């Protein structure tokens, strides 16, 4: 029959979970955001649409940090995004408290992964309306990760999600090809600003605000930090220049 899309834990006859699929819709509809894994860290950037001149500039920050070494950015239902990060924070804290060592990016990934997958198991809950790009540096290098409402996630060299997800994925792939030896944290910040500016064409209607953050072993001592001031403008420029 039909109606296999009214409850969250139901399998359609072809083996799907429409509710989860409908969630992905809420995501694709959201702003665009990316992650670039450089050779000793990860860079995060996001598209911040300026709905009006009323929004205090530089104020409604999107990228979130978990603990001190992990960075999170997501596209879709922001509130769901935060909800997830809160859980990640508790999740990371619980971990450190028992094992002392700050939670390894991979372990954290599956920590968020199992939680999210958990919301595709019961009809009493709604799946997450967000895709999340997150990562950081740990005992063995840097890691970039993307998590889907389905709970699925994998390690990426580059990742993008949202409205301009394709333009991005397009650009990210170009990078991967023209840099087999790796990209530097400094360079990834620039390239990210560009890739965000390009992906902004599928929303060229409203003006936006760029927001980059990175976690580099050599640049930030393995700590997640927001790219501000000079280095920021410098990237905004490197992008503004190549958009013409």
């Amino acid at each position: 029959g039909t109606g296999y899309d009214l409850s969250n834990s139901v399998f359609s006859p072809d083996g799907r979970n429409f509710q989860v699929e409908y969630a992905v819709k809420a995501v694709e509809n959201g702003t665009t955001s990316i992650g670039i894994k450089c050779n000793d860290g990860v860079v995060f950037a996001v598209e911040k649409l300026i709905t009006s001149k009323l929004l205090v500039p530089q104020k409604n920050v999107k990228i979130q940090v978990v603990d001190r070494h992990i960075g999170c950015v997501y596209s879709g239902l922001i509130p769901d995004g935060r909800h997830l990060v809160n859980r990640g924070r508790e999740e990371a804290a619980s971990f450190k408290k028992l094992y002392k060592t700050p939670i390894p990016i991979p372990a954290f990934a599956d920590r968020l992964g199992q939680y999210v997958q958990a919301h595709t198991l019961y009809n009493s809950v709604r799946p997450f309306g967000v895709s999340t790009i997150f990562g950081g540096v740990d005992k063995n290098g840097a890691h970039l990760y993307m998590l889907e409402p389905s709970g699925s996630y994998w390690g990426y060299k580059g990742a993008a999600t949202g409205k301009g997800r394709q333009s991005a994925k397009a650009e990210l792939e170009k990078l991967v090809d023209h840099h087999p030896e790796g990209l530097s944290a400094r360079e990834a910040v620039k390239q990210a600003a560009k890739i965000i500016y390009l992906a902004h064409e599928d929303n060229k209607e409203k003006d936006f605000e760029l927001e980059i953050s990175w976690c580099s072993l050599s640049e930030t001592n393995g700590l997640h930090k927001f790219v501000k001031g000079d280095l920021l403008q410098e990237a905004i420029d490197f992008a503004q220049k190549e958009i013409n």
Binding site: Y22, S52, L54, V56, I78, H119, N123, R126
Partner: protein, 233 residues
Amino acid sequence: FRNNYDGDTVTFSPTGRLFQVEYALEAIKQGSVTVGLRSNTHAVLVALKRNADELSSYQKKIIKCDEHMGLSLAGLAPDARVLSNYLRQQCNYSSLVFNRKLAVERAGHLLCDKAQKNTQSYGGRPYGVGLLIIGYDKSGAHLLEFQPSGNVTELYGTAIGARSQGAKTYLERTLDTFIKIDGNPDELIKAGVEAISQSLRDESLTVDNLSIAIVGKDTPFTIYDGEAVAKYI
């Protein structure tokens, strides 16, 4: 279509929408207009109080949460009481435990997370009220716009409620002007009354009809009603 995906908040529509949440957002539009705007020294709230008969009172739209924070509501009164009351506790807890004033930005993050919880669990319902929180903290004056969806945003000014679009455009225009109204509360207030009259239609703001609130540098959040607002009409 929509009829099969709006029976509760734990259901997504084939397009990624959460109707029950949207229906809640509607209750706000059906609500009486209220305006918020701030300079660098003060933040202000102006709200239109709506009454039932002419034998009834006008319902309060502004609520104080602390000596440095407060807000205006549009929508389900009860829900504002619940949310404001919860925002009072948070300010309270911030003091009692850290001897620290709860930053406006954080109060917002708190509201957002509280709201969000009523939009992913069976049995719960979203809050049918919009809020405009103003406050003065360690980083200055602030204005927040709270939506039942959970979306909280910091702006220089804004409005919500029926015909709110009027005032909002007016502020969006007056921006560069009121944002510089420092060291002068009365000026920031008049700019606030103007923005709000931009959403009038039915009548004109009277003394037992207008409601104003202000917080700032050396100004504890204080609400003005009746005779007190007379000097602005």
